[PDB]
């Protein structure tokens, strides 16, 4: 659309709460990490934002990017539906966390938290470790709704650039 | 700044990020919530930030709002750095979780991890502890910088009014 | 004094279906976790299942989680497995074994003597 | 879910060598747990918590290791120390044995 002004800097300010939930995502958690993480998507996906608002300072290699960030989005989406189904209908991605990440945390493990002995089952270790699946259930969800708003506004810009040229 | 689309977007864009941090920063996770939850700032301190996104939309009644927005940033500046503070130096101001909250997580709190049985400063269930300090401690420090994010594009405009008018 | 009781052997027919037990003794049952372990020569220990006698709490092997039974009695102080729709891949001994936590990790310090299942038409 | 390699599947030693046979884990875990097997009998719990011999067990034995990289050594094996060694862990749900470890008397 013509308020290149104004979606360029929302593609920035996704950009950069995909690194913000990004770096927060790697806080160390245990043994496996989401596929998001291990991909660095919210890295290389959340720059790609940032460089896509290059569209604020008004040649084809506009389209480049904005296709790069399409397909940035898109892969991004599709990561965070398969992390939150990685979480709650079984682990069939063991994405094996960055070791100086499982330094911190060597020994836990958030894709299953029933315990062994069921006397556990009502035990404090056993309600912290549900805490932690659902935080990153939760920043995968706020991560795949931001990345879903990318490809609503860069799909919205694409559309115009093949239509223009 | 003449920027009033560029600058209203970005506005928007903070403000959905506080309630999707606020939200996430509500996830259950035991007897105690930072002050940022329960005093609210994120949905109110959030959704006046949208509001102040009236910019976008080219009165002093705009002077009423964006002064609120700026005692939003402000005032969620300040509280993020308290919840911080009262996360790692001490447990100075014990603000009680929403009892809907507390009842996925009665008996767990992250304002304390060191276990009273020393055996156990190995075991799993601590190392479950202090993760949920870690992301608690940076879902705030990311609300923060975004809370400071604001004062700066909201001071840069409250200038612009007052010497306006 | 600790002791867990099995009946030494078992004979059941294919498709049919077994209720095996575990006479616990010298001990507080309803304190403990019961846990019940598998052996076969071709895949070693697996283990099946636990049971609380104290609530009734049950966590089980995902591989066993609807071959498996669990089951306790708090007053004859008798631990149950009933294992359903038996095949050759269930001939094993059976172990029951009780949990303690203890040095800091958790401890199967006591074993039942095994039940051996041999399942055969 | 972790699965306990242990090395070697036999161990053949002399009476009164010294030897050592190790579990290695596919994750990291909190402590291994040993247990002593001889045929037709339950498995004897040997090795608590990584290092701590259970009720009765020689001192001839021990345990060490941290992570991923777990041990038992016998300082001298005895004649009766012939039997299969399995390592345990608590750190993961489900609980998990390793293949054994025969130790044979070398003759």
């Known amino acids: 659309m013509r308020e290149s002004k104004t979606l360029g800097a929302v593609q920035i300010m996704n950009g950069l709460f995909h690194i913000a939930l990004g770096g927060l995502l790697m806080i160390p958690a245990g043994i496996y990490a989401p596929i998001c993480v291990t991909v660095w998507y919210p890295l290389w996906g959340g720059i790609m934002y940032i460089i896509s608002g290059s569209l604020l300072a008004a040649v084809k290699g506009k389209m480049i990017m904005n296709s790069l960030s399409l397909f940035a989005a898109i892969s991004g989406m599709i990561l965070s539906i398969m992390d939150i189904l990685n979480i709650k209908i079984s682990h069939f991605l063991k994405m094996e966390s960055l070791n100086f990440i499982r330094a911190h945390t060597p020994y836990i493990n958030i894709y299953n938290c029933e315990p062994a002995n069921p006397s556990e089952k009502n035990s404090p270790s056993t309600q912290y470790c549900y805490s932690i699946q659902s935080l990153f259930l939760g920043i995968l969800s706020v991560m795949l709704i931001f990345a879903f708003f990318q490809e609503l506004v860069i799909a919205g810009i694409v559309e115009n650039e093949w239509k223009r040229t | 700044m003449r920027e009033s689309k560029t600058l209203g977007a970005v506005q928007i864009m903070n403000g959905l990020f506080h309630i999707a941090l606020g939200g996430l920063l509500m996830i259950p996770a035991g007897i105690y919530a930072p002050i940022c939850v329960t005093v609210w700032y994120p949905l109110w301190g959030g959704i006046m930030y949208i509001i102040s996104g009236s910019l976008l939309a080219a009165v002093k009644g705009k002077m009423i709002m964006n002064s609120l927005s700026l005692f939003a940033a402000i005032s969620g500046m300040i509280l993020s750095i308290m919840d911080i503070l009262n996360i790692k130096i001490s447990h100075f101001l014990k603000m009680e979780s929403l009892n809907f909250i507390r009842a996925h997580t009665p008996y767990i709190n992250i304002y304390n991890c060191e276990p009273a049985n020393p055996s156990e400063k190995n075991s799993p269930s601590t190392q479950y502890c202090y993760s949920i300090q870690s992301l608690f401690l940076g879902i705030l420090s990311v609300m923060l910088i975004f809370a400071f994010f604001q004062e700066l594009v909201i001071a840069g405009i409250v200038e612009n009014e007052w010497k306006r008018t | 004094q600790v002791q867990l009781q099995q009946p030494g052997a078992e004979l059941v027919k294919p498709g049919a279906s077994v209720k095996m037990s575990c006479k616990a003794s010298?001990?507080?049952?309803?304190?403990?976790?019961m846990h019940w372990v598998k052996q076969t020569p071709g895949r070693g220990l697996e283990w099946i299942g636990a049971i609380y006698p104290g609530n009734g709490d049950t966590s089980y092997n995902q591989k066993f989680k609807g071959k498996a039974t669990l089951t306790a009695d708090k007053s004859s102080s008798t631990a149950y497995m009933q294992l359903s729709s038996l095949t050759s891949e269930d001939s094993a001994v059976y172990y029951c074994?009780?949990?303690?936590?203890?040095?800091?990790?958790?401890?199967?310090?006591?074993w039942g003597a095994g039940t051996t299942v041999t399942v055969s038409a | 879910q972790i699965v306990l390699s242990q090395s070697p599947a036999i161990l053949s030693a002399s009476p009164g060598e010294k030897v050592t046979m190790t579990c290695r884990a596919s994750?990291?875990?909190?402590?291994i747990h040993w247990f002593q097997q001889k045929p037709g009998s339950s498995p004897k719990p040997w090795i608590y918590a990584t290092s701590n011999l259970a009720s009765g067990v020689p001192v001839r034995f021990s345990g060490s290791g941290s992570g991923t990289s777990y041990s038992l050594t016998i300082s001298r094996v005895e004649a009766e120390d012939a039997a299969t060694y399995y390592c345990?862990?608590?750190?993961?749900?489900?609980?998990?044995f390793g293949g054994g470890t025969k130790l044979e008397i070398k003759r």
């Open positions: 345990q862990q608590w750190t993961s749900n489900p609980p998990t």
């Open positions: 074994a009780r949990s303690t936590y203890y040095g800091g990790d958790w401890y199967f310090n006591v």
């Open positions: 994750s990291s875990v909190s402590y």
């Open positions: 010298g001990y507080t049952f309803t304190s403990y976790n």
